[PDB]
Amino acid sequence: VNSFSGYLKLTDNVYIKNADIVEEAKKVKPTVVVNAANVYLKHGGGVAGALNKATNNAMQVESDDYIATNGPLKVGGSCVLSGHNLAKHCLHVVGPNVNKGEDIQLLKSAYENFNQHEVLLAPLLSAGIFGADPIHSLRVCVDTVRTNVYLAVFDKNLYDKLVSSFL
Ligand SMILES: O=C(Nc1cccc2c1[nH]c1ncnc(NN3CCCC3=O)c12)NC1CC1
Numbered sequence: 001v002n003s004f005s006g007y008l009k010l011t012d013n014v015y016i017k018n019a020d021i022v023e024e025a026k027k028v029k030p031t032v033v034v035n036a037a038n039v040y041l042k043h044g045g046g047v048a049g050a051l052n053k054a055t056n057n058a059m060q061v062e063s064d065d066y067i068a069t070n071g072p073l074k075v076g077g078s079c080v081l082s083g084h085n086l087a088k089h090c091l092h093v094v095g096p097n098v099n100k101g102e103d104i105q106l107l108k109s110a111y112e113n114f115n116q117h118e119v120l121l122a123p124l125l126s127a128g129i130f131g132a133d134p135i136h137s138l139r140v141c142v143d144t145v146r147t148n149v150y151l152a153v154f155d156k157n158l159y160d161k162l163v164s165s166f167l
């Protein structure tokens with residue numbers, strides 16, 4: 001039993017809710033919140049901009065030190081950093097950005113990072129400003145992640161479409 005509330009169960013291990021991931025994280029304080037990161041951990045907009053804003057820019061300060069030490073992430077890769085006031089940990093995961101021409105095939109590799117964590121609160125990778133089809137992202141999530149994932153979808157119309165079209 002965990003404290004995630006109001007989710008629709010899609011499969012044995014995938015759950016979904018129309019919710020603002022920032023408000024979900026603040027309420028639940030999950031062990032792991034996933035950020036929709038880019039390779040430079042520049043948290044300017046989308047989910048990343050919202051999560052970072054909620055940390056009063058502490059996420060960005062920590063991220064800049066991480067990049068200065070380690071260099072950029074790979075598309076499809078991840079790193080574990082602090083969850084600040086939102087979670088114990090933040091798993092920064094880089095899905096491909098279609099608006100940069102990045103290979104959508106890397107979306108499966110991106111979701112594989114979730115399997116290193118027993119339970120996660122997460123957005124749909126490569127959705128939103130990353131330009132992929134959220135229906136495809138949900139399918140890859142279900143077919144790749146084996147650990148327990150609680151998906152927060154900000155847009156109500158999109159959420160209803162994701163549920164109604166789910167196979
Ligand atoms: O500004 C925010 N939040 C916020 C800002 C921008 C985007 C999101 C967001 N929260 C989200 N939660 C889940 N997914 C998101 N984005 N995507 C990615 C793929 C489908 C989708 O809808 C966002 N919060 C402040 C008011 C307290």
Ligand SMILES: [Cl-]
Nearest residue numbers: 046047128129
């Ligand atoms: Cl977005």
